[PDB]
Every structure is written in structure tokens, then in C-alpha cells.
Amino acid sequence: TMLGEILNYYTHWTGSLRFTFLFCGSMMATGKILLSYSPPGAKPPTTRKDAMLGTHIIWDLGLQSSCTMLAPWISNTVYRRCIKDDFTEGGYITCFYQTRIVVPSGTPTSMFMLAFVSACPDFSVRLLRDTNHISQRT
Amino acid sequence: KDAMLGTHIIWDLGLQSSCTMLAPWISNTVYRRCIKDDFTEGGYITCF
Amino acid sequence: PTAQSTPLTSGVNSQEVPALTAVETGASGQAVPSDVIETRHVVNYKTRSESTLESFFGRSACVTILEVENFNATTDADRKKQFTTWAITYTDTVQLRRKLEFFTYSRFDLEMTFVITERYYASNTGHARNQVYQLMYIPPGAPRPTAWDDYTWQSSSNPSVFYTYGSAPPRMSIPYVGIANAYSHFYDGFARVPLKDETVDSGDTYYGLVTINDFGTLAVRVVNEYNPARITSKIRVYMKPKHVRCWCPRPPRAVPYRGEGVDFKQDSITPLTAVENINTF
Amino acid sequence: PTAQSTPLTSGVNSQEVPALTAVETGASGQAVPSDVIETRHVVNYKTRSESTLESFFGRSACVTILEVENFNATTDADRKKQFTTWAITYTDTVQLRRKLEFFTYSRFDLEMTFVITERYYASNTGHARNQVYQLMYIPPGAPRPTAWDDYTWQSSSNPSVFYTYGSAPPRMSIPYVGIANAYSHFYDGFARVPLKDETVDSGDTYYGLVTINDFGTLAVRVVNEYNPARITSKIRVYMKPKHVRCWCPRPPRAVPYRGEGVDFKQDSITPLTAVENINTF
Amino acid sequence: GYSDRVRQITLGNSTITTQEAANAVVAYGEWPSYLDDKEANPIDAPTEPDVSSNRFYTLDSVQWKSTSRGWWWKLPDALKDMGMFGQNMYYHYLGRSGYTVHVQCNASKFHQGALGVFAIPEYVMACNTEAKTSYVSYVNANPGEKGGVFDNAYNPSAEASEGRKFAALDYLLGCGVLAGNAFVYPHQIINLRTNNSATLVLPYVNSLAIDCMAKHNNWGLVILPLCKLDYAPNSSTEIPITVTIAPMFTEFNGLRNITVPATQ
Amino acid sequence: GYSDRVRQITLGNSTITTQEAANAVVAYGEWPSYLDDKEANPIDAPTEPDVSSNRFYTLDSVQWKSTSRGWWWKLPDALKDMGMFGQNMYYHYLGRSGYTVHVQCNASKFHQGALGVFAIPEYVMACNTEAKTSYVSYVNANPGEKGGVFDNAYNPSAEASEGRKFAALDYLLGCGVLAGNAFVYPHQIINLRTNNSATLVLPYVNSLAIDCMAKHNNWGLVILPLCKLDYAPNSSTEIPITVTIAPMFTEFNGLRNITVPATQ
Amino acid sequence: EAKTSYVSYVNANPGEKGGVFDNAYNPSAEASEGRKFAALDYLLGCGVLAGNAFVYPHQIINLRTNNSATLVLPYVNSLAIDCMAKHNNWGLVILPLCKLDYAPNSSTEIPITVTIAPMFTEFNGLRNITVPATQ
Amino acid sequence: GAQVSSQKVGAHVNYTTINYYKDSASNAASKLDFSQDPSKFTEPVKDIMIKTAPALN
Amino acid sequence: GAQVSSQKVGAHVNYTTINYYKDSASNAASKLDFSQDPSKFTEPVKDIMIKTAPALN
Ligand SMILES: CC(=O)N[C@H]1[C@H]([C@H](O)[C@H](O)CO)O[C@@](O)(C(=O)O)C[C@@H]1O
Ligand SMILES: CC(=O)N[C@H]1[C@H]([C@H](O)[C@H](O)CO)O[C@@](O)(C(=O)O)C[C@@H]1O
Ligand SMILES: [Ca+2]
Ligand SMILES: [Ca+2]
Ligand SMILES: [Ca+2]
Ligand SMILES: [Ca+2]
Ligand SMILES: [Ca+2]
Ligand SMILES: [Ca+2]
Ligand SMILES: [Ca+2]
Ligand SMILES: [Ca+2]
Ligand SMILES: [Cl-]
Ligand SMILES: [Cl-]
Ligand SMILES: [Cl-]
Ligand SMILES: [Cl-]
Ligand SMILES: [Cl-]
Ligand SMILES: [Cl-]
Ligand SMILES: [Cl-]
Ligand SMILES: [Cl-]
Ligand SMILES: [Cl-]
Ligand SMILES: [Cl-]
Ligand SMILES: [Cl-]
Ligand SMILES: [Mg+2]
Ligand SMILES: [Mg+2]
Ligand code: NA
Ligand code: NA
Numbered sequence A: 001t002m003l004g005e006i007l008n009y010y011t012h013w014t015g016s017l018r019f020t021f022l023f024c025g026s027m028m029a030t031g032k033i034l035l036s037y038s039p040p041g042a043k044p045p046t047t048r049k050d051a052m053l054g055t056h057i058i059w060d061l062g063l064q065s066s067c068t069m070l071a072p073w074i075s076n077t078v079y080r081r082c083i084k085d086d087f088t089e090g091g092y093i094t095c096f097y098q099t100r101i102v103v104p105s106g107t108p109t110s111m112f113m114l115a116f117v118s119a120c121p122d123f124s125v126r127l128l129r130d131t132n133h134i135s136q137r138t
Numbered sequence B: 001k002d003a004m005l006g007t008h009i010i011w012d013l014g015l016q017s018s019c020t021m022l023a024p025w026i027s028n029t030v031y032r033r034c035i036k037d038d039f040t041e042g043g044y045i046t047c048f
Numbered sequence C, D: 001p002t003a004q005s006t007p008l009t010s011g012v013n014s015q016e017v018p019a020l021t022a023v024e025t026g027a028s029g030q031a032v033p034s035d036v037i038e039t040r041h042v043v044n045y046k047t048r049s050e051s052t053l054e055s056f057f058g059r060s061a062c063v064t065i066l067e068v069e070n071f072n073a074t075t076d077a078d079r080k081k082q083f084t085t086w087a088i089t090y091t092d093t094v095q096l097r098r099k100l101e102f103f104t105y106s107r108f109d110l111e112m113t114f115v116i117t118e119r120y121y122a123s124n125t126g127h128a129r130n131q132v133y134q135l136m137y138i139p140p141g142a143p144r145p146t147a148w149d150d151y152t153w154q155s156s157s158n159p160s161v162f163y164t165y166g167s168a169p170p171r172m173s174i175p176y177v178g179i180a181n182a183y184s185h186f187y188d189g190f191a192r193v194p195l196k197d198e199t200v201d202s203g204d205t206y207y208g209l210v211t212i213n214d215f216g217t218l219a220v221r222v223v224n225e226y227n228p229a230r231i232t233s234k235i236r237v238y239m240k241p242k243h244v245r246c247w248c249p250r251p252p253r254a255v256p257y258r259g260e261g262v263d264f265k266q267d268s269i270t271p272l273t274a275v276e277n278i279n280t281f
Numbered sequence E, F: 001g002y003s004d005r006v007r008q009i010t011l012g013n014s015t016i017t018t019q020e021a022a023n024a025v026v027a028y029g030e031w032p033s034y035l036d037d038k039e040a041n042p043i044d045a046p047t048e049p050d051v052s053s054n055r056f057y058t059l060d061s062v063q064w065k066s067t068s069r070g071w072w073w074k075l076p077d078a079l080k081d082m083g084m085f086g087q088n089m090y091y092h093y094l095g096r097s098g099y100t101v102h103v104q105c106n107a108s109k110f111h112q113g114a115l116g117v118f119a120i121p122e123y124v125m126a127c128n129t130e131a132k133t134s135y136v137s138y139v140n141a142n143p144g145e146k147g148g149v150f151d152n153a154y155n156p157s158a159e160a161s162e163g164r165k166f167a168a169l170d171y172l173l174g175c176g177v178l179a180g181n182a183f184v185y186p187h188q189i190i191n192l193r194t195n196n197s198a199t200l201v202l203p204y205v206n207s208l209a210i211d212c213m214a215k216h217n218n219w220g221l222v223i224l225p226l227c228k229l230d231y232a233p234n235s236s237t238e239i240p241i242t243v244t245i246a247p248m249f250t251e252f253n254g255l256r257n258i259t260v261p262a263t264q
Numbered sequence G: 001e002a003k004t005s006y007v008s009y010v011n012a013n014p015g016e017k018g019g020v021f022d023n024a025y026n027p028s029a030e031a032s033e034g035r036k037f038a039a040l041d042y043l044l045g046c047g048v049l050a051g052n053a054f055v056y057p058h059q060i061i062n063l064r065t066n067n068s069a070t071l072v073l074p075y076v077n078s079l080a081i082d083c084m085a086k087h088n089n090w091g092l093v094i095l096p097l098c099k100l101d102y103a104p105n106s107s108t109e110i111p112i113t114v115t116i117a118p119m120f121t122e123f124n125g126l127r128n129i130t131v132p133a134t135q
Numbered sequence H, I: 001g002a003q004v005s006s007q008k009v010g011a012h013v014n015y016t017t018i019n020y021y022k023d024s025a026s027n028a029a030s031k032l033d034f035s036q037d038p039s040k041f042t043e044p045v046k047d048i049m050i051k052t053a054p055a056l057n
Helices: A002-007 C053-057 C095-100 D053-057 D095-100 E083-091 E179-184 F083-091 F179-184 G050-055
Strands: A010-014 A017-023 A032-038 A055-060 A066-071 A092-097 A113-119 A124-128 C061-070 C083-087 C103-120 C132-138 C160-164 C171-174 C217-222 C231-249 D061-070 D083-087 D103-120 D132-138 D160-164 D171-174 D217-222 D231-249 E007-011 E014-018 E062-064 E071-075 E092-104 E112-121 E187-191 E197-202 E219-230 E239-255 F007-011 F014-018 F062-064 F071-075 F092-104 F112-121 F187-191 F197-202 F219-230 F239-255 H003-006 H014-017 I003-006 I014-017
Touching: A002 A010, A002 A113, A002 F179, A017 A032, A032 A066, A055 A066, A055 E092, C053 C095, C053 C231, C061 C083, C061 C095, C061 C217, C103 C160, C103 D132, C132 C231, C217 C231, D053 D095, D053 D231, D061 D083, D061 D095, D061 D217, D103 D160, D132 D231, D217 D231, E007 E092, E007 E239, E014 E092, E071 E239, E083 E092, E083 E239, E092 E112, E092 E219, E112 E179, E112 E197, E179 E219, E187 E197, E219 E239, F007 F092, F007 F239, F014 F092, F071 F239, F083 F092, F083 F239, F092 F112, F092 F219, F112 F179, F112 F197, F179 F219, F187 F197, F219 F239
Parallel strands: A055 E014
Antiparallel strands: A010 A124, A017 A066, A017 A113, A032 A055, A032 A092, C061 C231, C083 C217, C103 C171, C103 C231, C132 C160, C132 C217, D061 D231, D083 D217, D103 D171, D103 D231, D132 D160, D132 D217, E007 E014, E062 E239, E071 E219, E092 E197, E092 E239, E112 E187, E112 E219, F007 F014, F062 F239, F071 F219, F092 F197, F092 F239, F112 F187, F112 F219, H003 H014, I003 I014
């Protein structure tokens, strides 16, 4: 992602992450979707009844096409590391049907949503470094 | 280890001979009944 | 100036719905945590100091490795090893190039630094006296050397730096020298319009910035005449953009470069590693 | 500000008994000579200047010795001698470590200094031109070199110092770079919580600061290509904490270290020499 | 721009959106609140868990079919195993709570049906044996998040021991009153042509300031199909109903060891 | 009454209406404008053709299918044969222009799909031979109003002479970057359930005040199906995409005989 | 001595039972058998002399003087807040500085009881419950 | 012609700059510029969007 | 921006400092800080203990 690519020039990050979802079914499709952020240190959620104990939003599909779920800054350290690291693990984002998607006849029964990520205004990075995303033969 | 999760006092024996433990008023109803009654049960006093 | 503090907020039960939007508008999501959770007050003293363009670009990056030698040359090939010429570019290496290419246009002054290293080619050919290097900037149009000791090295007008081996890495500043109001990192076009029924070749013409860019030539020699011992040298060229402005952000390079253009290589266009499942933590 | 002067005092015959106390309280003894003897007036002009934390830590201490070589490498093992990488730590040596470990937490800027030395591996393989060294700081996540001449050394963003053999020891300052509000010298914990019935290995996991600390890597090379004469180099790394604050004092290390943790060695846990008698002057 | 149909609700770390609401009900016109010193009863400093517990918990979804007779839950019973709300409830003798109830049911402009959504104070229901009166087991009265279903038939048990469950008879609201009069209780209707959600904000309701949550449910939540689900291309279609409930202004007294109710 | 969904745009003798818009984008927050004396370069009195050229030109429509990988155009290339704009462009050495881009795609409340509509400054694309770099013919780079299409496969030519066209590989945006990051460029989405049009207002963007329009395209217009077209009654259905573009604040310098570019 | 810093989570986190010191150090033959603390009394289980433990906040229970010790502890860390399930902020050490002696019965035992109240507790990052490994 | 400016804070004041060269290109790094306007990229919309209001009315 | 400060006395005046660098981390040693409060370690008791009074009354 654009955020991921910028973070790979830095060692440290802090702040809130914004996840925005765009439903791209037909206008005739309805539904309720649960979007959850579970801060770390417990069983990763694989069921709605565990996911809904964390930070979450119930998204009602409708005229407003898009729903924003926040992963608010919830961390022991003041910065997390821009690497896979148990000590600065960030937790778990999951998604469940709250009801289900319902369509009438003559309507696609399968469809998609798009997920976007961006940094919030509380977000900053430190300690410039080379990225592992570009290299050349020698 | 169950008793110490409730309201409790640790009494050190010494020159002051006496220790007061309170059962503070903690009830659903505004009054309890002066009979044996599940609904107005008052709870448990223990000592270890 | 600091990154955003978090205000104290409790819950809502309201016709105000900051959690919903419509990204069809071209607006990104805008909601912040205080819009969708109960928040405490947190004073944010942290700053975005290290992600300003000056901070992001504030590094000397290696952009090329040049080679020159000093020995008694008896063939045309060996005479051409006594000096080197390099068309000035940031496309010989990938790291600084990729950072610049977050942007379409830029304006900056340049700090150029050089690291010069030597080794003996052989033992039992005696030794070599300490070498002086000439690095001559040849702007477009100025005559290019054809030998290490031709007239061009007198450098009456071209800037030259004379570097003594073992001294501090040499360094100089270059102004913003662009003939436009900014440098173009990308140019969607050609150097000339090919016209109806002209006889000019259209089969071997190029496209983009390579057709219009010319920052001149760096020429390097060892000033010393040959010793019995052949010495081989590397000159590493470093660039730091300073006093930086940039315009029109771009997605960064996701796959290997294969030259000076945006072209990609058929065996290297799969940057993502497939996940086992859409549900993999 | 000076250490305490002694007041003029004579004797006492009093219900005031400053000689007695009760250290069960957790208070140390407080009595001073004027409490228990007749004292003259002595003006104390002496100061505790040299035992401030800045004074105690105000020294460049050797923290490691690195090795690099420059020769024509024909095997994988010999190619790996052309550069070195070192995880930055103060635990390779004992002297600075023991001083820091008087404290639980610290905050300081760092002066890093390097001493670079060479010797000829052999005679009758000729000579070697003066060598330039690159010392590259690789922050966690930045790509680590696999060869002395790979792309990582172009160092567009990583800080590098180019050092010319025979020049003044190179030196730079590092800010307080901790991701916490202080450095932890001791961490009574783990990097992750192992959870009920998880399949993750619990048999080969570690404990303490080693599970969470990462100050990145120092990579060193000789920039020069090989001479006929093999040159072997040592790089001594020096650290001086400056602008120092420390918290939560600790008993100092009483027995030899045996690694990065607080572990002790069975043959080295008897620091005291037994006295002949409790009555030995 | 602002609409009776479009709403955001944020409590703690949880947000709900709806784009096809029909206003929102505040039961008896009263927002929940903390217990005032002038109405207080237990004298210990209460626990007010705030954002840990006062947040949206989503129950297991149920399926609305053309044959469904309806669904019931009790509160706080439905939330007794929900995160820190459940822990605070069972570690204390006493608790009080308001709620935001958000019932979710979307379909299409071609579906039809209407759900009555009722919040009922002291929702006492009939037992299923005529050998006894008021003869319901704790376990059957307190099903938790699964709740229960209504039936359109009353078949009381041959033996008293087999009838210790609710006779949840739809048209008598499981309690001997006509379902058509349930509108005297705080309610919304989810009429699929109009709206896809119901929102009810409930104050604490009781004859006491605070009570034993593990003994006593303050509210029933009833969802009755007033008009059956119909969909012309498939009369056997099912659409989910999802219930999401946030405790509000939670306050607990009488801390001790944890309550672990009988499961049989 | 006024709505983010309902818009009228009038330029010269041309008007667009939409009743299902989603606001409008002004690229980098900057409306186009004429070139100020304090930023000017060529010194001849410029031609400002105004209403003759600064008006909506409708390109040939393209068909969106379930198998479409997307479409690209360059500007001012796409408008080079459009009325008096084309004549002013080719009679002058130098030109600058902003644009109103209006992308049109209607369907039904039963169709689904999403188009990303991106305006890309200096939209440089990869060539289709690995024997050379930056090896694209003028004719293939400048297709005019027909534009080009993306592919989901990269098949570079055996011979350099056969590969002098763009490798318009969809997921690399035809230029070695991931398409998911195209949102850093000024954009809208046509999501068929929400909107039937995208409107982008573009200022002149270049490292110069004014440039050779016949040599240099300032903008790429990219339309990518982010979510494929789907329609349950006919998966093979096609719906048109129509592109209508108005030059704005056009200014030309260096009048001479007309430029007639090579066609082969 | 086959490894460094080699302690299992379960042995590091015994809970209310705590652990005991020993006056002998007997490191394990096999690395897998030595993943517990070497709680050697005179080195305070950490390679420093126990006589210097008085630099830490302390009291002494000297039976002739007192029957209790009270220590009030602020939060101490290099962070404002941290993962309690990963990281212990404080150790509590009780060392017999002078051995228990009772003339009528040298084998007598007297209880030591530890009572601890958390104070000014504050928690962030609510989710599902952490259930640590027990083996 | 000495400039005295605030240093970037460390673990636990001011610094002095004199320019030695007649060309600004010779100067050290530009002073920290905290300017930003993310909205030109994150919200480049013609009509104001109020977060609490519907995006489409 | 020269600082003039007292030197540490020798066998038998002032010195001048100018900071040359934009980062405080570059600066020479912190000035002598004679701050101390031994009582936080030597006497961290809740109730004041007067030396002349009994420690336990
Ligand atoms: C660049 C290189 O490899 N040079 C090597 C030379 C060349 O092979 C010459 O051809 C023969 O001297 O040979 C050596 O044995 C030598 O001269 O001592 C080692 C030296 O490193
Ligand atoms: C590091 C070391 O011990 N080097 C020694 C070498 C090596 O043994 C080589 O293998 C053979 O030259 O041998 C010497 O006799 C030499 O070359 O003059 C002495 C030299 O100090
Ligand atoms: Ca909104
Ligand atoms: Ca809020
Ligand atoms: Ca020469
Ligand atoms: Ca005393
Ligand atoms: Ca005296
Ligand atoms: Ca080398
Ligand atoms: Ca609270
Ligand atoms: Ca005109
Ligand atoms: Cl070299
Ligand atoms: Cl010359
Ligand atoms: Cl130029
Ligand atoms: Cl995976
Ligand atoms: Cl050496
Ligand atoms: Cl290099
Ligand atoms: Cl750190
Ligand atoms: Cl002795
Ligand atoms: Cl339950
Ligand atoms: Cl055309
Ligand atoms: Cl325990
Ligand atoms: Mg449950
Ligand atoms: Mg045409
Ligand atoms: Na702030
Ligand atoms: Na004194």
C-alpha cells in the first residue's frame, strides 16, 4: 500500500490507522457488516462473538457507500517498529456478516468491496532507512 | 484466596487488642427482611 | 508544530454519522478515532520533522561507480582505460532514483561527494607514487577528451576538481541547473514532432525523458604519468538533493527497473507473495 | 555547591539521642560526626564535581573489536572476510556495561569514535595502496550486505562514514533513539504472551532485554579493490554517553558476565577472598 | 443534508452506521444516566466500567423465514457473556444499565415484511405446564445471546418436570395479553420497504435504584413478524436479523468472588 | 433542494447534466487559469480562442464488459482532431490547457461494478520489447480519441521493431507501480450502485508555463474496472463508457503553418 | 550454561505461589531442563551481592522490633504504560538476613503472609481476554 | 551575519550558522518546514464535505 | 551566540562555547549539575524521622 511503502523508509511509526470500505454490489443489495480491531495479547478472533469484544463498527449498507473503521493508537511503546516484531505487534483486524447480504431476484448474489488504508493526523514516523522493496544486480 | 476477593481487613495482633470489620450496606433492596430469605440474602462472613 | 492530539470524547446517539462517507467523490476517508470510539485526552508532543522533504532527501546516496587506471598503455583499448567519461544521471543505481520518483517534478541544489579507492593490479612491478585525480564537469557542447592527456583537461571554463589520493572525499555544490522551472522525473512525450511523409527514421526513435535529458558529462583521469606498477581506481559518485521542493506525488516503483525508462522485465512483475488465505493473521 | 562543612560542637548530656535509630524503617543511618563527638569548625571547599553522572560517564569506552580484510577472495568464506556486520550492543565488553548497569533506566546522546588499524598478512606479495573504509549504520529493516561490493553500500538513506586510513579517528553523535521514554538496562519480561494451547514453540524461547532490543547493525568494508598484498584490519568501536540522565540505582555486577543477560558461571561465583578471622585488621 | 434515515452511533471503541433508519426511540422519553446521590442505596463506591463495557456487542444472527413466529431476548441476560460487561456483571452482587438496542435487517426493494421491535419492562412469560403455575427453570428463563423463539401453538407438557420452559405463544405475547397491544411498549417497526434498522435507547427501569442482574432481567426484547417475509422468486428465502446492544451508564456495587450460574 | 448528486456544467455552446454525480474533483485543489505576466515565457501576444475551443468534445464511446481490463487516453492527444481546439493546437508551436473531464456510465439498480477514473500527470508507460528501453513509436503513443486498452498479460515482442507500443499491464498501471496506489492521483470512482458519472477539473500541470502539445501529453486519463461489471440476467452484457472533455483557459504561442504529424 | 537468558514464560510467571531462593547453584546437564531461575540467595539470583540490595526500596522485619513491613510503590518503567502479561515492573524479595531461632524448638516455623493492593490502576486496549500458556 | 536558531531537542538550546559562500546553493540543509495541506490530495473536492453530514445528500 | 561560563579551578577564569551544529546531540558534555536528593534512597519514609527523636515512639 502507499502507507506501507512510505513506512518501509522508516524504522518507527505511531498513530491511528483508518480502514475505509467501499461496497460495490448492486443498489438492490442490503447488508450489515461488522469490522473489528482487537488489540494484541489474546486469542486471535475467528468468530464474530470474539471480534465484537474488541474495537468495532457495524456498517449498514445503503446510500452512503463507504464505512470507516479506525484502529486507534493502542500500544505499550510510544512507537512500533516497521518490521514483523512480537514486542510491537499491533493486533487483529477481522470482518463478519452482522446480518447477511440480501438481494432480490435478477440481482448478482456475489459481489465485492474494496478496502483502503490511510494514516490519521496523529500519525508520524522516525529513523530514515533503506527499503527492502528495491534492489539491483552487482 | 476466595475470601480476600471480598470486603476484608487484615488484623495485626498487638497492643491494640481489638479489630473492627464492617459489613457495609450492599443490597439490591433498600431494606432486607428479618427472616431467612433468598431474595434479601446478605452474603458471607469468614475468617482465615 | 506537532502531530494531532486526541480530545476527551464519550459516546453519541445522533443523526451525525462521521463513520459513513462516499469515496466515489475522490475524497479519502477522513474519520479519526474520536469519531467512532470513546477517547481520553492525549497531548501529542511528537512531530513530523523526519518526513519533511528536506529530511527524506537529506542523505548522500551513491549514484554510480566509475573506473580509471594508470599504466603504460600500448593499445587503443588500454589508452581508453587511462580516463573515463560518464553521462551524469541518477538511473545507474535504484535507491535515490526510487525516492525521487515518489514525485513528478522537483527543484533542488545538489551536493556532490566522491569516494576514490585504489589497488595494485600486480606485485613484482615495483610501486606507484601518490596519485592526483582530475574530475572535470563537461557541460553539453564542451569538447570531450579522446585521451587522458589531450588539451581538454586544461579546463579553462569547465569546473574541475583536483583530488589528492588519501585526502578527505572531495565535495562541491551544484545549483538548480534545469532549463525548465523544475526538473521532470517523468516526461510523457518526444524531443520532436515527426511530420507527414518525412524521410526521417521513425523505426529506431525513443520515448520519454531519455529523448530530452542532458546534464553533461563527468570526465575523470589520473593526472600522474604511469609507474611500473599498474594502479586501478574506483570513483564512487554521491548525490544529496538539498533545498528541496517536489510536486505531484506518484505511486513508488513496485517492480525492478530494467533501464532509464519505466519499462519492466517479464520475469520480475510479481512483487506480492500470495497469502495462504484471505483470513491469514 | 560543596560537600558538607563541619560545625563547631562540644558535648551533650541530653534526652536527644541522634546515635540511636531503627533501620527496620528502611531509612539508612543519618547521624554525622557532630552528633556523636566534639567537632571543630572545618570549612569544606571540596565539591562532588567528578561523581555527577555526566562526569562518571564522560569517557569514550571500547565496546567491540571488528575485523575486515582486503584480498582476492576465491571462496565463500574468504568473500565474507571482505566486509563485516555487527549488531550494535554494549555487551561485547564489560567495563562500560558494568557502569551503565548501576542504573535500571537511562537517557543519553551517544558519541561514537572509531580506531582503525592494519597489518600486512605476508611479505613478498608486494604492497597495498592506502585504504578507505565505509562504516554504514543499518537501522532495523534496512537491507544487510551479502558482499563487500553489493548495492546496499550506495547508502542513499543509511548514514555512512568514509574513513581514510591514517586520518584522525572518525566520530559522530547519535541522539537518544529509544522507542520508549528511556533506555531499559534491564527488562523483566518477554516480547510476546504465549497463549493457552497455541502450537508456537515454548521450549527454545528467550527472556529479558535480548527478546526486545534492536539498535540495528554496523556494516564495515574496505572500499578499495584487492592489492597483491592481503591487508587485515581491526575497527575498535568507542561509545561515550553524553547529556546523561539515569533512574533506579542497582547493586553493581559482583561476578563475571557470561553473555548478554544477568546469568552467572558456576566456576566464577566466589568474589570474596575469605578473611583469616572476623578480627583481621 | 442531514436525514432521519442516516445515523451514526459511537459507544467506546464501536460504531454503527445505518442509511435506512426511521428516527430512533428513547424509551419513555428518558436517556439513561448514572445513579444520583439523592436516589442511591448501596453505600460502597461503585464500579463504573465506562468504555470497557459500554460498547456495542453483536449477538449471533437469526434467520427470518416466511414461517418464523418471532424471537425474544432478556437484558442483561443476553449480554452476560459479553466481554468486560459480563465480567463486571458477575463479579458484583448489584448492577444497573441502560442500553442502545440496534436491530439490523436489510433485504431489497422487491422483498416485503414487517418486524415489530418491542422493549418490554419486566417481560414475565407463561410456563409450559398446567400441573403448576410460575414453573420455569433458571436455565430456560436465561438462554443468553441465543434468546428464544415464539410458537403459534400452545402444547403444555404431560409432566410438570417437562414443562419448565416459557410457553412463548406469539399472539398472546407469551404472557396472556394480545400482541396487537404491544405498541404501548417502546418500539419501532422494520418495514422492509421503508427501513433496514430499529434503534431503541433504554434507561434503567425498575422499582429499585439497583438490583441483582444475575437474578432479574429488567427488559425483554421482542421481535415479531407483523407481516410475513415474502419474496416472489423464492418464498423459502431467509434474511438475517442481527441484534447489536451497548450497555450505557453501567454502575456496579457489592464486589466479591465471581458468580458462576448453574448451566443445568 | 441542491444536491451533491445533481450538477450542470456549461462551457461555450455545450452543457452537461448529471442526476447521479458524487461531488466533483478539482485536481490538487487548483482551478485552471490563464498564464500570469510574472510566470510568462514566450513573448508573442498569445491566442486565447475561448468559446471556439473551450467546450465539451465527446469521444467515441467504449464498451464495458465483464472481461474489460480498462482504458487510457492522453491529453491533449485525445482532443487533437476536435474542432477549433485541434486547429489552434496544430497552428501553434506552444499551447497550455486545463480540462473538465466528464466520464459517463449509467446502468441499473440491478447492475454492479466500479470504475477508477484517474488523471495522471506525465503518464509515462512501459514499451513492449525487452531488446530496447523507452522504445515506443509516436503513432502508438498518440492514438487520439480512440485511446488504448489495458491487458492482464505482458507478452513482450520477439523483435524490437514489433514491440514499439505500450505494455499497458493493468495491475502495474502500465508503468511498474501497483494500481492500488493510483488513488494518490486526482480521481473519482463510478460505483454503479452510487453514481453514473465522474467529474475532474484539471489545471495545467508541467515543469514549464507552456509547452509543445504535439510533442508532450501533460495528463493521462485512466479508467480501470476495480470491481468487474456483473448483471445476473446476462453476464455477457455490455454498458457504454462515454468520455466528454472540455479544454479550459487555452492559450497558444508561436503561430506558423499547420503541424501535420506522421500517421505511420 | 548451554544457553543465556533461557527461562520459560511459565517458570518466570509462577503467580501468587512465587518462588524460593537456594544457597546452591546446580545448572542443568541439558538446556531443556534449566529453563527456570537460578535464584542463588547471596547473588540475589542476578549476579550482584545481596548485601547491596538496600539500594532498592526496603524495610526489615526484625522480630524483636516489628511484625510487618509496608512499602508503597509508584508505577516504575521506561514507558507510561505497558503489557502486564509480558512484563513484570517489580520484584518482591524476602531474604532471611538473620536466621529464625527459637530456643525451645529450633525446627519451629512461623508464617510470612504477603498482602498487596493495586493502586491508581489504569488499562488501555480492551479486547477478548488473554489466557496465557500454563505449560 | 550569524543566525542563532533552536536545535532539535535530544535526550535531555541554540546553535549558530554563518554562511561562508556567495552562492545559496553552497548552504547547508533548509530549516525544518512543517507546512502541510493533505486535503489537496485527501479531499480535492469542489463542494465542502462536512464529516458529520452525509457525503451524498 | 557565544556562551561565557566559569571554568573548573586549577592549581592557581571563564571559557567560551559556540555550538556549530543544528542538533543538540552534537553538543559537548552537559554543564556540571550539582543537584542531589539522597533522601529518596537513604530515607524514603512516609512519616518524618527527626534524628534527635526516637526512630520508633
Ligand atoms: C587484479 C588481479 O587479479 N591481480 C593479480 C595479479 C594478476 O593476475 C597479474 O596478471 C599477474 O601479476 O597476480 C598476482 O599474483 C600478483 O601479481 O601478485 C595477484 C594479483 O592480485
Ligand atoms: C598473519 C601472519 O602470521 N603472517 C605471517 C606470514 C603468513 O604465515 C603467511 O601464510 C605466509 O606469508 O608469513 C610471514 O613469514 C611472511 O609472509 O613474511 C610472516 C607473517 O607475519
Ligand atoms: Ca459523513
Ligand atoms: Ca467519541
Ligand atoms: Ca595518467
Ligand atoms: Ca534517633
Ligand atoms: Ca557534638
Ligand atoms: Ca574491498
Ligand atoms: Ca471508571
Ligand atoms: Ca479571444
Ligand atoms: Cl579501488
Ligand atoms: Cl593538463
Ligand atoms: Cl536541464
Ligand atoms: Cl500467508
Ligand atoms: Cl590491525
Ligand atoms: Cl558503492
Ligand atoms: Cl529502541
Ligand atoms: Cl585476611
Ligand atoms: Cl450467552
Ligand atoms: Cl483523434
Ligand atoms: Cl496465581
Ligand atoms: Mg456468549
Ligand atoms: Mg477525431
Ligand atoms: Na499536538
Ligand atoms: Na561546604
